[PDB]
Amino acid sequence: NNLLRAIEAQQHLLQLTVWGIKQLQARILAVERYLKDQ
Amino acid sequence: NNLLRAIEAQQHLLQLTVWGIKQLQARILAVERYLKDQ
Amino acid sequence: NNLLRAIEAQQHLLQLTVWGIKQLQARILAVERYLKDQ
Amino acid sequence: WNEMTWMEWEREIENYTKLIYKILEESQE
Amino acid sequence: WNEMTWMEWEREIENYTKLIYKILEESQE
Amino acid sequence: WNEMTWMEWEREIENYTKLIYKILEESQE
């Protein structure tokens, strides 16, 4: 049970890191494009 | 025991990815602000 | 068995987040350097 | 790795995530 | 998700991390 | 944490990853 609970919580952590990476990728891409456009 | 050890090591990996995401977020934010300011 | 399978899949997720963070770090660094150079 | 796109990355993340959900659900029964 | 801030993100990360620590500690006893 | 570089980060990631591989392999035997 403890191991299952740990995996469950770690999956939530993974989902949070994925959210963060997706937002950072969009933001860096927007900056790269801004600089190209300028 | 093996599963516990794997979870423990994976938690350290998660912590490392969190460190990295936090630093990248700060750095992209600083760039976004620099460009806004310019 | 289920717990092992979950850990295995989560390791693949971790590897994917690491790939993403590495690429974002390189891209932000390139932008930071571009702006310094300009 | 150098031959992977962000859309493929999202697809792979989704696939593993769905698998893990299914495994965890089956662990409850 | 689109309604979440980075401060909230850090809070949620911290909360799950602390929970996992506690679970792992209890697994040792 | 503030005293860590990206090369050190990669090293630590690699070390934990290799350990996990070994543990998972041993779980199969």
PDB file of C-alpha atoms in Angstrom:
ATOM      1  CA  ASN A   1       0.000   0.000   0.000  1.00  0.00           C
ATOM      2  CA  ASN A   2       2.744   2.476   0.880  1.00  0.00           C
ATOM      3  CA  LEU A   3       4.518   1.838  -2.409  1.00  0.00           C
ATOM      4  CA  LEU A   4       1.277   2.340  -4.365  1.00  0.00           C
ATOM      5  CA  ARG A   5       0.606   5.606  -2.531  1.00  0.00           C
ATOM      6  CA  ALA A   6       4.134   6.805  -3.305  1.00  0.00           C
ATOM      7  CA  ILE A   7       3.737   5.967  -7.012  1.00  0.00           C
ATOM      8  CA  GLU A   8       0.387   7.782  -7.080  1.00  0.00           C
ATOM      9  CA  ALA A   9       1.911  10.931  -5.552  1.00  0.00           C
ATOM     10  CA  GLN A  10       4.926  10.704  -7.852  1.00  0.00           C
ATOM     11  CA  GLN A  11       2.589  10.535 -10.858  1.00  0.00           C
ATOM     12  CA  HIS A  12       1.078  13.852  -9.740  1.00  0.00           C
ATOM     13  CA  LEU A  13       4.591  15.299  -9.483  1.00  0.00           C
ATOM     14  CA  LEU A  14       5.360  14.059 -13.000  1.00  0.00           C
ATOM     15  CA  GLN A  15       2.184  15.675 -14.307  1.00  0.00           C
ATOM     16  CA  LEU A  16       3.190  18.959 -12.677  1.00  0.00           C
ATOM     17  CA  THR A  17       6.678  18.832 -14.242  1.00  0.00           C
ATOM     18  CA  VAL A  18       5.098  18.113 -17.629  1.00  0.00           C
ATOM     19  CA  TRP A  19       2.809  21.157 -17.265  1.00  0.00           C
ATOM     20  CA  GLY A  20       5.838  23.275 -16.445  1.00  0.00           C
ATOM     21  CA  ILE A  21       7.945  22.015 -19.338  1.00  0.00           C
ATOM     22  CA  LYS A  22       5.081  22.597 -21.792  1.00  0.00           C
ATOM     23  CA  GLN A  23       4.656  26.181 -20.617  1.00  0.00           C
ATOM     24  CA  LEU A  24       8.401  26.874 -20.751  1.00  0.00           C
ATOM     25  CA  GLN A  25       8.641  25.414 -24.252  1.00  0.00           C
ATOM     26  CA  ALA A  26       5.842  27.687 -25.485  1.00  0.00           C
ATOM     27  CA  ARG A  27       7.450  30.727 -23.832  1.00  0.00           C
ATOM     28  CA  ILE A  28      10.948  30.115 -25.205  1.00  0.00           C
ATOM     29  CA  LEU A  29       9.485  29.456 -28.650  1.00  0.00           C
ATOM     30  CA  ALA A  30       7.617  32.784 -28.473  1.00  0.00           C
ATOM     31  CA  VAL A  31      10.863  34.575 -27.565  1.00  0.00           C
ATOM     32  CA  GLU A  32      12.838  32.823 -30.313  1.00  0.00           C
ATOM     33  CA  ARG A  33      10.177  33.883 -32.831  1.00  0.00           C
ATOM     34  CA  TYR A  34      10.079  37.456 -31.514  1.00  0.00           C
ATOM     35  CA  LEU A  35      13.850  37.750 -31.987  1.00  0.00           C
ATOM     36  CA  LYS A  36      13.698  36.213 -35.463  1.00  0.00           C
ATOM     37  CA  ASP A  37      10.927  38.656 -36.385  1.00  0.00           C
ATOM     38  CA  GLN A  38      12.875  41.653 -35.102  1.00  0.00           C
TER      39      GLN A  38
ATOM     40  CA  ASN B   1      12.845  -3.688  -1.197  1.00  0.00           C
ATOM     41  CA  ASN B   2      13.825  -3.250  -4.841  1.00  0.00           C
ATOM     42  CA  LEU B   3      10.641  -1.329  -5.575  1.00  0.00           C
ATOM     43  CA  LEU B   4      11.217   0.961  -2.574  1.00  0.00           C
ATOM     44  CA  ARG B   5      14.795   1.621  -3.688  1.00  0.00           C
ATOM     45  CA  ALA B   6      13.583   2.456  -7.198  1.00  0.00           C
ATOM     46  CA  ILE B   7      10.964   4.889  -5.848  1.00  0.00           C
ATOM     47  CA  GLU B   8      13.601   6.526  -3.636  1.00  0.00           C
ATOM     48  CA  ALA B   9      15.955   7.042  -6.596  1.00  0.00           C
ATOM     49  CA  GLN B  10      13.097   8.268  -8.779  1.00  0.00           C
ATOM     50  CA  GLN B  11      12.196  10.838  -6.112  1.00  0.00           C
ATOM     51  CA  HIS B  12      15.744  12.207  -6.379  1.00  0.00           C
ATOM     52  CA  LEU B  13      15.327  12.392 -10.160  1.00  0.00           C
ATOM     53  CA  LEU B  14      12.043  14.266  -9.705  1.00  0.00           C
ATOM     54  CA  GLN B  15      13.725  16.722  -7.350  1.00  0.00           C
ATOM     55  CA  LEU B  16      16.457  17.314  -9.925  1.00  0.00           C
ATOM     56  CA  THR B  17      13.902  17.963 -12.697  1.00  0.00           C
ATOM     57  CA  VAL B  18      12.073  20.385 -10.402  1.00  0.00           C
ATOM     58  CA  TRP B  19      15.326  22.285  -9.731  1.00  0.00           C
ATOM     59  CA  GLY B  20      15.906  22.511 -13.466  1.00  0.00           C
ATOM     60  CA  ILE B  21      12.399  23.696 -14.299  1.00  0.00           C
ATOM     61  CA  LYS B  22      12.563  26.369 -11.580  1.00  0.00           C
ATOM     62  CA  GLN B  23      15.848  27.703 -12.935  1.00  0.00           C
ATOM     63  CA  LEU B  24      14.590  27.700 -16.532  1.00  0.00           C
ATOM     64  CA  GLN B  25      11.402  29.502 -15.517  1.00  0.00           C
ATOM     65  CA  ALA B  26      13.401  32.247 -13.789  1.00  0.00           C
ATOM     66  CA  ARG B  27      15.721  32.588 -16.798  1.00  0.00           C
ATOM     67  CA  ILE B  28      12.954  32.789 -19.405  1.00  0.00           C
ATOM     68  CA  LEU B  29      11.078  35.277 -17.231  1.00  0.00           C
ATOM     69  CA  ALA B  30      14.223  37.437 -17.022  1.00  0.00           C
ATOM     70  CA  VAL B  31      14.544  37.362 -20.824  1.00  0.00           C
ATOM     71  CA  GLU B  32      10.854  38.153 -21.356  1.00  0.00           C
ATOM     72  CA  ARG B  33      11.209  41.140 -19.010  1.00  0.00           C
ATOM     73  CA  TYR B  34      14.429  42.310 -20.675  1.00  0.00           C
ATOM     74  CA  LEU B  35      12.689  42.324 -24.067  1.00  0.00           C
ATOM     75  CA  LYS B  36       9.636  44.114 -22.676  1.00  0.00           C
ATOM     76  CA  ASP B  37      11.924  46.717 -21.098  1.00  0.00           C
ATOM     77  CA  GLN B  38      13.843  47.272 -24.327  1.00  0.00           C
TER      78      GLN B  38
ATOM     79  CA  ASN C   1       4.038  -6.828 -10.821  1.00  0.00           C
ATOM     80  CA  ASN C   2       1.704  -3.860 -11.248  1.00  0.00           C
ATOM     81  CA  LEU C   3       3.938  -1.664  -9.113  1.00  0.00           C
ATOM     82  CA  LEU C   4       7.022  -2.685 -11.120  1.00  0.00           C
ATOM     83  CA  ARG C   5       5.225  -1.921 -14.386  1.00  0.00           C
ATOM     84  CA  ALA C   6       4.197   1.495 -13.060  1.00  0.00           C
ATOM     85  CA  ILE C   7       7.781   2.300 -12.006  1.00  0.00           C
ATOM     86  CA  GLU C   8       9.051   1.203 -15.427  1.00  0.00           C
ATOM     87  CA  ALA C   9       6.581   3.491 -17.226  1.00  0.00           C
ATOM     88  CA  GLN C  10       7.334   6.344 -14.834  1.00  0.00           C
ATOM     89  CA  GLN C  11      11.051   5.964 -15.591  1.00  0.00           C
ATOM     90  CA  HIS C  12      10.250   6.506 -19.279  1.00  0.00           C
ATOM     91  CA  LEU C  13       8.278   9.623 -18.334  1.00  0.00           C
ATOM     92  CA  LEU C  14      11.240  10.879 -16.297  1.00  0.00           C
ATOM     93  CA  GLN C  15      13.561  10.305 -19.244  1.00  0.00           C
ATOM     94  CA  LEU C  16      11.208  12.286 -21.478  1.00  0.00           C
ATOM     95  CA  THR C  17      11.089  15.203 -19.007  1.00  0.00           C
ATOM     96  CA  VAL C  18      14.889  15.154 -18.813  1.00  0.00           C
ATOM     97  CA  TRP C  19      15.137  15.330 -22.627  1.00  0.00           C
ATOM     98  CA  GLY C  20      12.783  18.296 -22.593  1.00  0.00           C
ATOM     99  CA  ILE C  21      14.607  20.166 -19.841  1.00  0.00           C
ATOM    100  CA  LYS C  22      17.957  19.657 -21.597  1.00  0.00           C
ATOM    101  CA  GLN C  23      16.592  21.061 -24.848  1.00  0.00           C
ATOM    102  CA  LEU C  24      14.973  24.040 -23.108  1.00  0.00           C
ATOM    103  CA  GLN C  25      18.183  24.802 -21.221  1.00  0.00           C
ATOM    104  CA  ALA C  26      20.181  24.849 -24.466  1.00  0.00           C
ATOM    105  CA  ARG C  27      17.579  27.073 -26.151  1.00  0.00           C
ATOM    106  CA  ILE C  28      17.353  29.619 -23.329  1.00  0.00           C
ATOM    107  CA  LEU C  29      21.145  29.710 -23.101  1.00  0.00           C
ATOM    108  CA  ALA C  30      21.335  30.420 -26.851  1.00  0.00           C
ATOM    109  CA  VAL C  31      18.853  33.292 -26.447  1.00  0.00           C
ATOM    110  CA  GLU C  32      20.676  34.712 -23.416  1.00  0.00           C
ATOM    111  CA  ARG C  33      23.927  34.658 -25.411  1.00  0.00           C
ATOM    112  CA  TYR C  34      22.294  36.213 -28.480  1.00  0.00           C
ATOM    113  CA  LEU C  35      21.021  39.110 -26.356  1.00  0.00           C
ATOM    114  CA  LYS C  36      24.391  39.553 -24.649  1.00  0.00           C
ATOM    115  CA  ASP C  37      26.077  39.589 -28.063  1.00  0.00           C
ATOM    116  CA  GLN C  38      23.661  42.171 -29.446  1.00  0.00           C
TER     117      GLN C  38
ATOM    118  CA  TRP D   1      16.514  11.585 -29.268  1.00  0.00           C
ATOM    119  CA  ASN D   2      17.757  14.425 -31.478  1.00  0.00           C
ATOM    120  CA  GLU D   3      15.207  13.220 -34.036  1.00  0.00           C
ATOM    121  CA  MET D   4      12.164  13.914 -31.847  1.00  0.00           C
ATOM    122  CA  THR D   5       9.632  16.735 -31.977  1.00  0.00           C
ATOM    123  CA  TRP D   6       7.583  18.334 -29.225  1.00  0.00           C
ATOM    124  CA  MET D   7       4.368  16.876 -30.650  1.00  0.00           C
ATOM    125  CA  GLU D   8       5.909  13.388 -30.511  1.00  0.00           C
ATOM    126  CA  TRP D   9       7.111  14.142 -26.985  1.00  0.00           C
ATOM    127  CA  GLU D  10       3.552  15.029 -25.926  1.00  0.00           C
ATOM    128  CA  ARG D  11       2.224  11.851 -27.559  1.00  0.00           C
ATOM    129  CA  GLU D  12       4.722   9.661 -25.706  1.00  0.00           C
ATOM    130  CA  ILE D  13       4.010  11.424 -22.393  1.00  0.00           C
ATOM    131  CA  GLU D  14       0.280  10.859 -22.911  1.00  0.00           C
ATOM    132  CA  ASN D  15       0.771   7.190 -23.770  1.00  0.00           C
ATOM    133  CA  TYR D  16       2.829   6.382 -20.677  1.00  0.00           C
ATOM    134  CA  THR D  17       0.522   8.450 -18.475  1.00  0.00           C
ATOM    135  CA  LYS D  18      -2.585   6.585 -19.651  1.00  0.00           C
ATOM    136  CA  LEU D  19      -0.812   3.252 -19.114  1.00  0.00           C
ATOM    137  CA  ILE D  20       0.164   4.204 -15.574  1.00  0.00           C
ATOM    138  CA  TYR D  21      -3.436   5.268 -14.804  1.00  0.00           C
ATOM    139  CA  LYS D  22      -4.685   1.895 -15.994  1.00  0.00           C
ATOM    140  CA  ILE D  23      -2.093  -0.008 -13.932  1.00  0.00           C
ATOM    141  CA  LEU D  24      -2.885   2.021 -10.797  1.00  0.00           C
ATOM    142  CA  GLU D  25      -6.616   1.503 -11.296  1.00  0.00           C
ATOM    143  CA  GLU D  26      -6.098  -2.257 -11.610  1.00  0.00           C
ATOM    144  CA  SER D  27      -4.067  -2.151  -8.382  1.00  0.00           C
ATOM    145  CA  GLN D  28      -7.154  -0.913  -6.536  1.00  0.00           C
ATOM    146  CA  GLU D  29      -9.310  -3.881  -7.553  1.00  0.00           C
TER     147      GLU D  29
ATOM    148  CA  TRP E   1      -4.295  23.848 -15.742  1.00  0.00           C
ATOM    149  CA  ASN E   2      -4.276  27.128 -17.675  1.00  0.00           C
ATOM    150  CA  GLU E   3      -5.505  28.747 -14.455  1.00  0.00           C
ATOM    151  CA  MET E   4      -2.391  27.896 -12.427  1.00  0.00           C
ATOM    152  CA  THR E   5       0.521  30.080 -11.360  1.00  0.00           C
ATOM    153  CA  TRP E   6       4.144  29.203 -10.698  1.00  0.00           C
ATOM    154  CA  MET E   7       3.721  29.878  -6.976  1.00  0.00           C
ATOM    155  CA  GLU E   8       0.802  27.422  -6.881  1.00  0.00           C
ATOM    156  CA  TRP E   9       2.904  24.964  -8.879  1.00  0.00           C
ATOM    157  CA  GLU E  10       5.692  25.185  -6.280  1.00  0.00           C
ATOM    158  CA  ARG E  11       3.169  24.705  -3.464  1.00  0.00           C
ATOM    159  CA  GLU E  12       1.731  21.570  -5.068  1.00  0.00           C
ATOM    160  CA  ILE E  13       5.216  20.167  -5.760  1.00  0.00           C
ATOM    161  CA  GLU E  14       6.160  20.753  -2.118  1.00  0.00           C
ATOM    162  CA  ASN E  15       2.979  19.112  -0.841  1.00  0.00           C
ATOM    163  CA  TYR E  16       3.402  15.918  -2.857  1.00  0.00           C
ATOM    164  CA  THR E  17       7.120  15.792  -2.072  1.00  0.00           C
ATOM    165  CA  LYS E  18       6.527  16.010   1.685  1.00  0.00           C
ATOM    166  CA  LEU E  19       3.851  13.305   1.440  1.00  0.00           C
ATOM    167  CA  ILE E  20       6.192  10.989  -0.444  1.00  0.00           C
ATOM    168  CA  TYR E  21       8.942  11.550   2.165  1.00  0.00           C
ATOM    169  CA  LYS E  22       6.522  10.594   4.918  1.00  0.00           C
ATOM    170  CA  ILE E  23       5.360   7.459   3.073  1.00  0.00           C
ATOM    171  CA  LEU E  24       8.950   6.367   2.369  1.00  0.00           C
ATOM    172  CA  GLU E  25       9.936   6.968   5.988  1.00  0.00           C
ATOM    173  CA  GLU E  26       7.012   4.843   7.186  1.00  0.00           C
ATOM    174  CA  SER E  27       8.139   2.106   4.780  1.00  0.00           C
ATOM    175  CA  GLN E  28      11.429   1.861   6.674  1.00  0.00           C
ATOM    176  CA  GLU E  29       9.780   1.146  10.029  1.00  0.00           C
TER     177      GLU E  29
ATOM    178  CA  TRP F   1      21.149  23.749  -4.835  1.00  0.00           C
ATOM    179  CA  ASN F   2      22.164  27.256  -5.917  1.00  0.00           C
ATOM    180  CA  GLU F   3      25.722  25.910  -6.073  1.00  0.00           C
ATOM    181  CA  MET F   4      25.014  23.369  -8.825  1.00  0.00           C
ATOM    182  CA  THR F   5      25.838  23.458 -12.527  1.00  0.00           C
ATOM    183  CA  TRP F   6      24.066  21.894 -15.483  1.00  0.00           C
ATOM    184  CA  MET F   7      26.944  19.466 -16.039  1.00  0.00           C
ATOM    185  CA  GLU F   8      26.641  18.305 -12.416  1.00  0.00           C
ATOM    186  CA  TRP F   9      22.877  18.063 -12.888  1.00  0.00           C
ATOM    187  CA  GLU F  10      23.370  15.778 -15.907  1.00  0.00           C
ATOM    188  CA  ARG F  11      25.851  13.649 -13.950  1.00  0.00           C
ATOM    189  CA  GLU F  12      23.423  13.188 -11.059  1.00  0.00           C
ATOM    190  CA  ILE F  13      20.544  12.376 -13.434  1.00  0.00           C
ATOM    191  CA  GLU F  14      22.716   9.763 -15.152  1.00  0.00           C
ATOM    192  CA  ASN F  15      23.784   8.217 -11.849  1.00  0.00           C
ATOM    193  CA  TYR F  16      20.252   7.777 -10.513  1.00  0.00           C
ATOM    194  CA  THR F  17      19.014   6.561 -13.896  1.00  0.00           C
ATOM    195  CA  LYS F  18      21.683   3.851 -14.112  1.00  0.00           C
ATOM    196  CA  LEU F  19      20.902   2.770 -10.540  1.00  0.00           C
ATOM    197  CA  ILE F  20      17.197   2.492 -11.305  1.00  0.00           C
ATOM    198  CA  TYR F  21      17.939   0.412 -14.437  1.00  0.00           C
ATOM    199  CA  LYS F  22      20.020  -1.974 -12.356  1.00  0.00           C
ATOM    200  CA  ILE F  23      17.325  -2.286  -9.668  1.00  0.00           C
ATOM    201  CA  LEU F  24      14.600  -2.913 -12.268  1.00  0.00           C
ATOM    202  CA  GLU F  25      16.751  -5.506 -14.026  1.00  0.00           C
ATOM    203  CA  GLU F  26      17.335  -7.322 -10.730  1.00  0.00           C
ATOM    204  CA  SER F  27      13.566  -7.280 -10.147  1.00  0.00           C
ATOM    205  CA  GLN F  28      13.103  -9.370 -13.291  1.00  0.00           C
ATOM    206  CA  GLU F  29      15.370 -12.187 -12.102  1.00  0.00           C
TER     207      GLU F  29
END
